[PDB]
Structures are given as C-alpha cells and as structure tokens.
Amino acid sequence: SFEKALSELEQIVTRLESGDLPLEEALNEFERGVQLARQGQAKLQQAEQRVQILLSDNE
Amino acid sequence: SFEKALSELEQIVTRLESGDLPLEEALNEFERGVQLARQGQAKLQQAEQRVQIL
Amino acid sequence: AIFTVSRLNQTVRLLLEHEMGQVWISGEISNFTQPASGHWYFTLKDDTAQVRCAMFRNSNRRVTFRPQHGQQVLVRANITLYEPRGDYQIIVESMQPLLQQKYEQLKAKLQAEGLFDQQYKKPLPSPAHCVGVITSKTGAALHDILHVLKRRDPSLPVIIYPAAVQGDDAPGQIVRAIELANQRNECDVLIVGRGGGSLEDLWSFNDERVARAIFTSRIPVVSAVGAETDVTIADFVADLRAPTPSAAAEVVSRNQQELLRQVQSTRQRLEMAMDYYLANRTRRFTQIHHRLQQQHP
Amino acid sequence: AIFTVSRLNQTVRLLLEHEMGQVWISGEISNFTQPASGHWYFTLKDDTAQVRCAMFRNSNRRVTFRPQHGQQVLVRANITLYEPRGDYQIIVESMQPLLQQKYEQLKAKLQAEGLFDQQYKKPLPSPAHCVGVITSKTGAALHDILHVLKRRDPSLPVIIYPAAVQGDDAPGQIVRAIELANQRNECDVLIVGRGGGSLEDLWSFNDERVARAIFTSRIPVVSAVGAETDVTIADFVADLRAPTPSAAAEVVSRNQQELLRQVQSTRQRLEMAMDYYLANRTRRFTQIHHRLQQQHP
Amino acid sequence: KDDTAQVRCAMFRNSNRRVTFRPQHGQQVLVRANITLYEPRGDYQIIVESMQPLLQQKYEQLKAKLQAEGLFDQQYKKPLPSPAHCVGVITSKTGAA
Amino acid sequence: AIFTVSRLNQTVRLLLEHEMGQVWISGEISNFTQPASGHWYFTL
Numbered sequence: 024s025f026e027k028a029l030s031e032l033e034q035i036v037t038r039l040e041s042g043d044l045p046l047e048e049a050l051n052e053f054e055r056g057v058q059l060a061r062q063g064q065a066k067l068q069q070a071e072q073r074v075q076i077l078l079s080d081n082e
Numbered sequence: 083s084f085e086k087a088l089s090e091l092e093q094i095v096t097r098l099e100s101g102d103l104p105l106e107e108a109l110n111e112f113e114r115g116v117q118l119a120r121q122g123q124a125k126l127q128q129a130e131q132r133v134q135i136l
Numbered sequence: 137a138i139f140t141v142s143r144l145n146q147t148v149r150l151l152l153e154h155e156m157g158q159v160w161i162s163g164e165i166s167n168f169t170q171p172a173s174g175h176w177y178f179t180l181k182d183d184t185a186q187v188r189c190a191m192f193r194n195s196n197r198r199v200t201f202r203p204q205h206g207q208q209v210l211v212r213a214n215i216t217l218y219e220p221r222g223d224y225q226i227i228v229e230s231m232q233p234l235l236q237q238k239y240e241q242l243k244a245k246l247q248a249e250g251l252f253d254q255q256y257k258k259p260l261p262s263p264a265h266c267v268g269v270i271t272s273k274t275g276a277a278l279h280d281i282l283h284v285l286k287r288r289d290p291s292l293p294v295i296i297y298p299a300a301v302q303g304d305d306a307p308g309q310i311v312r313a314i315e316l317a318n319q320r321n322e323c324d325v326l327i328v329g330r331g332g333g334s335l336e337d338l339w340s341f342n343d344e345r346v347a348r349a350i351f352t353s354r355i356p357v358v359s360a361v362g363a364e365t366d367v368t369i370a371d372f373v374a375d376l377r378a379p380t381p382s383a384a385a386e387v388v389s390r391n392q393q394e395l396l397r398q399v400q401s402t403r404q405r406l407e408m409a410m411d412y413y414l415a416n417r418t419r420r421f422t423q424i425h426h427r428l429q430q431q432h433p
Numbered sequence: 434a435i436f437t438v439s440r441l442n443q444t445v446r447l448l449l450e451h452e453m454g455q456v457w458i459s460g461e462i463s464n465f466t467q468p469a470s471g472h473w474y475f476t477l478k479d480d481t482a483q484v485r486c487a488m489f490r491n492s493n494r495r496v497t498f499r500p501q502h503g504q505q506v507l508v509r510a511n512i513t514l515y516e517p518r519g520d521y522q523i524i525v526e527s528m529q530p531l532l533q534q535k536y537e538q539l540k541a542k543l544q545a546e547g548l549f550d551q552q553y554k555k556p557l558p559s560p561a562h563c564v565g566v567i568t569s570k571t572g573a574a575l576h577d578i579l580h581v582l583k584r585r586d587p588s589l590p591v592i593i594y595p596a597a598v599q600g601d602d603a604p605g606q607i608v609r610a611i612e613l614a615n616q617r618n619e620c621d622v623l624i625v626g627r628g629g630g631s632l633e634d635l636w637s638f639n640d641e642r643v644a645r646a647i648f649t650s651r652i653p654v655v656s657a658v659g660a661e662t663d664v665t666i667a668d669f670v671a672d673l674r675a676p677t678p679s680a681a682a683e684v685v686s687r688n689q690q691e692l693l694r695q696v697q698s699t700r701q702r703l704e705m706a707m708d709y710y711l712a713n714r715t716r717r718f719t720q721i722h723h724r725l726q727q728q729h730p
Numbered sequence: 731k732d733d734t735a736q737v738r739c740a741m742f743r744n745s746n747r748r749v750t751f752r753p754q755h756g757q758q759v760l761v762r763a764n765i766t767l768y769e770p771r772g773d774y775q776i777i778v779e780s781m782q783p784l785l786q787q788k789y790e791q792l793k794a795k796l797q798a799e800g801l802f803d804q805q806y807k808k809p810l811p812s813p814a815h816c817v818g819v820i821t822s823k824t825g826a827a
Numbered sequence: 828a829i830f831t832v833s834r835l836n837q838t839v840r841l842l843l844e845h846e847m848g849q850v851w852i853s854g855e856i857s858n859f860t861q862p863a864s865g866h867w868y869f870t871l
Contacts, residue, residue: 036402039409044413046417056406063399070395071290071291073290073293077291078290078293079295088699094703112707119703131579131587133593135593140534144456144484156448185439185517210435219482222485401764412768412770554809735833760829786831
C-alpha cells in the first residue's frame with residue numbers, strides 16, 4: 024500500500040516533468056505530492072519506530 | 083620529436099580550455115597547434131626502415 | 137610431447153592428488169603387516185575390489201584399537217601413486233570401526249524419496265510482512281534475527297515459536313513448531329535454526345521427522361542451522377539455506393533504510409522538477425514582456 | 434559421500450581415461466614375457482620409475498623386430514586401471530625403435546642450480562631503441578620478423594648478427610654472437626630464434642653452453658624458437674618467451690596505427706575547443722550590442 | 731570548479747539555513763552530494779547535502795607531474811630476492827608499525 | 828576518498844564510455860548549426 028503512493032510521486036514527477044501542466048493544476052499537483060511526501064516522511068519514520076512494539080526484542 | 087610534439091600539443095589544448103586568453107593570443111596559439119599537428123603526423127608516415135649486418 | 141617414464145608417473149600423481157584429494161572410505165582389513173620402522177601396511181578390500189594402503193607412525197599412534205584380520209573400518213584417506221614402482225596406493229590418516237554413517241544413510245534415504253529436489257521448493261516473500269522464528273526462547277539465532285531486523289528492517293514484525301533445538305526431544309518440538317506455524321498461517325516465512333552448536337545439536341535437526349515437517353511446510357522455510365560448514369538435513373530440505381541466522385534475516389529483511397533514502401531521492405528531484413517548470417514559464421513571459429518595452433506607441 | 438572400495442576404483446579409472454587419453458612414451462624394455470595364449474607383456478623402466486605395459490595379439494601383429502632387454506622403444510599407449518585388484522598399467526597400440534632423456538636430465542640439473550629463477554630476469558625496455566637479431570641470413574625467421582616489423586613500426590634500427598642455427602657447430606657461433614653484442618653495446622633488446630623444425634634440428638638451443646650465454650647476458654633476451662608448441666631450455670632462461678618469431682616482433686615494437694589514432698583524436702579536441710571558445714566570446718559581444726540598440730532615445 | 735573541470739550544482743532551502751559560514755566566490759568548500767542527470771533537458775548536475783571549509787589538490791598535481799616523468803613505469807622496477815639474507819626496516823623505533 | 832572536480836569528471840567519463848559503449852538511437856534534428864571548422868552540432 025505504501026509503495027503505491029511512492030510510485031505515484033514519481034508519476035507526479037513523470038507528469039510534472041512533462042511540462043504541459045497549466046499553472047492552476049500544476050500547483051495543486053505539487054501540493055498533493057508534498058502532502059504525499061510529507062506522509063512519506065512520517066510513515067518512513069514511523070516504520071523505524073516499530074522496533075519498540077512489533078519487533079520481539081524480548082525473551 | 084613525436085612524443086615531445088604530442089606532449090607540447092597537449093599543453094596547447096589545456097590553455098584553450100582555461101579560457102583566459104585574449105583573441106590574438108588564442109589565434110596565435112591555435113596556429114601554433116594545428117601547424118604542429120600536421121608536422122607530427124607527416125613525420126610519422128615519412129620514415130622508413132634501416133638495417134645493417136655484422 | 138613424448139613422455140619419459142619419470143614424467144608420466146609424476147603427471148598422474150599430480151593429477152590424482154589435485155582432483156580427488158581427501159576422501160572417506162569404508163571397507164575390510166586384510167594382510168595386516170607391521171615392519172620394524174613402525175608403519176602399518178595393509179590392503180583394504182570389499183566384496184569385489186582391493187586397494188593398497190599405508191599408515192605412518194604419527195597417525196597410528198592415536199588409533200585406540202589394535203586392528204586384526206577381517207574387521208570393518210572407516211578411514212580418511214589421501215590418494216597418491218608410488219612412482220619408483222608404479223603402485224596405486226592410499227595414505228591413511230585416521231581410522232575407527234557411528235553417527236556419521238547414520239547421517240550419510242539418512243541423507244541417502246531422504247534423497248531417494250526426493251525431499252531434496254528443487255521442484256518442490258517455493259519462492260520467498262518479497263517484500264515480507266511477517267516472519268516466524270522457530271528457535272528456543274533464548275536461542276542465539278533469535279537474537280541474531282532480531283539484531284539484523286533491528287538494523288536493516290525495523291518494520292517487519294517477528295513472531296516467536298519456542299522450540300526445543302537440542303536433546304532427544306528436539307525433533308518432536310521442531311515438527312510440532314513447523315506444523316503450528318503453518319496452522320496459524322500468521323507468518324509469511326519461517327526461519328529455523330539454533331545457531332552455533334555441537335554435532336549433537338546438528339543431529340537434533342538431522343532427523344527424518346524434521347525433514348518431512350519442513351517438506352510439508354506450506355509456508356516457505358529458511359534454514360540457518362550452524363555455520364556455513366554445518367550443513368544439516370533441514371538445509372537440504374529447506375527452500376533456502378542461510379550460512380548464519382543473521383544472513384537468513386538479511387534475506388527476509390527489507391532494505392528499509394534504503395527505502396527511506398529511496399523516497400528522499402524522489403523528493404529531491406520533485407523540487408528540481410518544480411524549479412525547472414517555473415523557470416521556463418518565467419523566461420517565456422519575460423521575453424514577451426520585453427517585447428512590449430521595445431514597442432513604444 | 435562415503436566411498437565403498439568398488440565405487441572408488443570406478444571413479445579413478447574413468448578419470449584417467451578422460452584426462453589422459455592416448456600418449457606417446459619412450460623407455461627401456463625389461464622382464465619381457467610372452468604368454469602361450471598369444472599376448473605380449475613387458476615392463477618399461479627408466480633410472481627412477483617403471484610402469485607395467487601390455488600389448489595384445491590383435492595389435493602385436495604389426496611388429497617388425499624382436500625386442501631384447503635394454504632396447505629403446507617408442508610406444509603409443511592408453512592408461513588404464515584393472516579395477517578388482519588396483520593395478521596401474523598401460524595398453525599398447527604401436528611400437529618402433531636418445532634425445533628425450535638428455536632433455537629431461539639437463540633440465541633438472543639447471544633447475545636446481547637456479548638459472549630459471551625470476552630473481553635474475555630483467556624487464557624489457559619500452560619503447561626500444563635498437564633491436565638485435567641473432568639468426569640465419571636466409572632463415573624464415575629473419576624475413577618474417579623484418580616484414581612484420583615494417584608494418585607495425587618502421588624507423589626502428591635493426592642490427593642482424595649472423596650465425597648458423599643448425600648443425601653441431603651452431604652453438605659455438607651463437608655464444609660468440611651474444612658476447613659480441615654485449616661487448617659492442619649499441620643495442621637494447623636482443624632477439625634469438627629460428628623457425629619451425631623437428632627436434633633433431635632444434636637441438637642447438639638445448640646445449641648447456643648456449644643456456645649459460647643467455648644467462649650472464651646484460652641485455653634482455655626474447656626467445657622465439659620453433660612453432661607455437663616447441664619448448665627448449667633456452668626458453669626458460671630467456672627473459673620472456675615469445676610463442677613464435679612473429680610474436681617476438683610484437684612484444685618489442687610499438688603500434689603505428691595506434692599513435693596515428695592518437696594524433697588524430699587530439700586534433701579533434703583542439704578543433705572543437707576553438708569552436709566553443711569563439712561562441713562564448715561572440716555571444717558576450719552580441720548581448721552587449723543588443724543592450725546598446727535598446728538604449729536608443 | 732577547478733583548473734580543468736567544472737560541474738553544475740544546486741542546493742535547496744532544506745539545507746541552506748543550516749550552513750554556518752556565508753559561501754563566497756573563491757572559497758574552498760567541501761560538499762557531500764548526489765550525482766544526477768535531469769532527464770527532460772539532458773543536463774549534468776549535482777545536489778549538495780553539506781558544506782564545511784588544500785591537501786588533495788597538491789597530491790593530485792604532484793602525481794601527474796611525476797607521471798609524465800615516468801617514475802611509475804615497469805621498466806624501472808626490480809624483482810625481490812627469493813631467499814632474502816638481511817631485511818632492513820626504516821620506521822620509528824617507538825612506533826607500532 | 829574525496830574527489831577533486833577534475834578526477835570526478837574523469838571517472839564519470841570512463842564509466843559511460845565503458846558501459847553503454849556504442850548504440851543506435853533515433854530522434855528528430857533540432858537546432859542545427861555548423862561553425863567554420865566544419866564540424867556539425869545539433870540536438871536530438
């Protein structure tokens with residue numbers, strides 16, 4: 024599920040690098056990626072926090 | 083000498099890629115180079131074999 | 137080339153030693169002789185074959201039993217040729233009349249049944265979402281798997297299956313542990329192995345029941361019993377063999393840190409894509425804007 | 434895997450047949466026995482080794498003489514192992530009636546004395562200044578070397594030091610030639626060799642006199658004797674073995690076409706540099722000119 | 731830039747504020763960065779990750795100077811003796827080497 | 828190791844020249860030009 028957003032981010036890069044976006048859609052396109060990427064920062068950081076619970080670091 | 087000329091020609095290129103010369107110096111340097119290039123190539127194809135015995 | 141007799145025997149000797157080297161042989165002893173020099177010369181025979189052997193003083197000192205005619209023995213041998221006479225003979229290093237024999241017999245029996253065939257193996261999950269560990273509640277392998285996961289893939293949850301991995305009771309729990317994991321079906325991949333241990337610990341996994349349990353395991357199974365040189369039956373039957381429990385975790389573990397960097401790279405170029413797009417537009421308008429400056433009314 | 438003696442003998446016999454195959458052997462006949470059944474049995478020995486040999490009636494037919502003890506023979510043989518008793522023996526397929534023994538006996542004497550060591554070998558100069566050739570006036574090697582050299586690198590002075598490269602008087606003149614080149618000292622790399630031939634005519638370069646001349650030679654020496662498959666004693670002493678006389682000219686000489694490709698490529702860079710240099714200056718003037726135009730009142 | 735090669739670089743706002751010194755022209759700078767190519771216009775650029783302000787250039791400039799003089803050629807190298815008789819060590823007597 | 832700028836471009840050039848080698852490519856000619864020396868310059 025997480026990887027789908029990551030690929031979509033490069034789809035945004037794929038689409039935005041096309042250069043055909045009008046400014047109105049283009050800026051809204053960038054905001055979508057930033058929030059998606061901003062989610063990426065949290066989820067990636069959250070993935071690191073799984074050591075406290077999910078990892079069975081106990082007898 | 084071919085190796086001296088090749089090495090000397092190599093330094094002509096290096097200055098031209100530093101991009102600090104005046105026009106007259108660049109053109110003067112360019113005519114130093116290409117002239118030296120033909121002379122080198124001709125001398126390579128001009129020599130021939132020598133052998134002697136005893 | 138034309139061979140002289142000296143060079144021919146030399147080529148064969150170098151060829152023979154270089155190819156086969158050391159080997160394990162079994163047979164029967166006949167014509168046992170002991171000259172004054174202390175060496176043992178004897179012929180090792182079977183129902184329809186014979187080979188000539190020699191044992192030097194250093195090696196025979198450590199042999200605990202006095203060989204006698206008509207005895208069954210197990211040998212570790214070095215194969216060579218005696219040049220001055222042209223005799224094919226064996227040099228012996230150790231001898232004894234065993235678990236090693238049973239291990240070989242067990243391996244052959246399982247190999248005949250085809251449990252080692254690659255056609256029955258299954259691919260490992262990628263990316264993995266849950267991994268099951270079949271090891272003692274405080275075994276070294278469990279700590280190694282967690283240590284690797286704690287570094288490479290902190291996101292992967294781990295489920296522990298307390299299993300006996302030594303003693304006569306180990307095969308029973310190992311079979312039950314594998315079956316229990318499959319019955320629960322909560323793990324995408326199973327890692328089996330105690331880690332470092334003695335030959336008896338390896339024998340605990342070298343069991344027919346363990347082999348069948350791994351073979352019947354619907355979930356993929358990764359074997360990490362012992363070190364790289366401690367291959368066991370579980371390794372032969374497991375879908376994949378790992379030199380150490382840490383290596384097994386590495387295969388299962390995602391490159392989570394790389395994934396973090398992987399995403400970071402996309403954000404970098406997204407900013408580059410953003411800057412380049414507006415750069416072209418700004419130049420475009422500035423060009424047409426300047427065209428107004430020229431066109432004074 | 435545990436070997437039983439039966440399987441051990443099979444593997445060795447199969448290995449020997451594949452790896453060795455048919456061979457050519459020479460030696461001395463001993464213990465000739467002729468069974469009444471029609472076969473042909475004897476032992477071949479040298480001063481340090483021996484091997485059991487056998488020849489059968491279906492191949493023993495085609496012999497044109499009667500062997501006696503102490504005769505020298507040349508034999509085509511196949512190497513085999515009699516499996517149930519571990520006997521190493523060869524089966525003969527041809528037979529017919531000096532120098533191969535000398536070659537082996539001379540090689541080991543020099544190897545122990547240390548003339549073959551890497552310590553005393555000197556690296557070849559590059560690019561060479563003057564190359565001396567020690568061979569016949571009309572030999573095939575001389576023409577081949579000069580014509581291959583004229584293609585890759587003319588303008589290299591070559592000096593030919595004449596000497597005969599066949600007959601019993603050849604080695605004396607070769608040693609005199611090598612000493613003449615070192616003494617006069619107007620050359621840097623020395624080539625000695627000849628074209629292909631039989632062993633009866635390559636013998637000149639296996640003498641101890643010539644070997645001790647290449648060793649104790651100040652100049653580096655490249656040995657190109659015979660076809661690609663001929664090895665002589667001079668080859669091991671020399672500082673670099675070239676498989677054929679043509680290859681000798683290849684390791685000494687430069688490559689004319691590669692230098693020509695070098696001078697061409699550097700000109701492409703020089704020409705391309707000026708185009709970029711002018712364009713940068715031209716555009717800089719172009720913009721400053723545009724600004725002046727736009728400033729018109 | 732240096733005397734022979736030039737590479738284009740850019741640094742985003744994510745890291746500009748956390749560079750202690752004010753970058754200036756003619757200032758030697760150490761940067762750790764990614765090497766990348768921008769596909770849509772085919773340009774060769776680098777993305778900078780850190781900046782903090784002699785030795786490396788001297789070594790590189792020395793090596794090429796010696797290279798042309800050919801001190802590195804196999805023509806001048808000597809093989810080691812096999813049964814060495816007396817090996818000499820040149821090193822600090824108080825050192826761990 | 829710390830790359831100087833010159834060494835970096837050297838290793839980068841050797842990399843592409845050694846991996847991609849010689850390839851067949853297709854595209855449309857754009858921005859053609861031909862300076863005095865006679866070489867052709869253009870963008871695909």
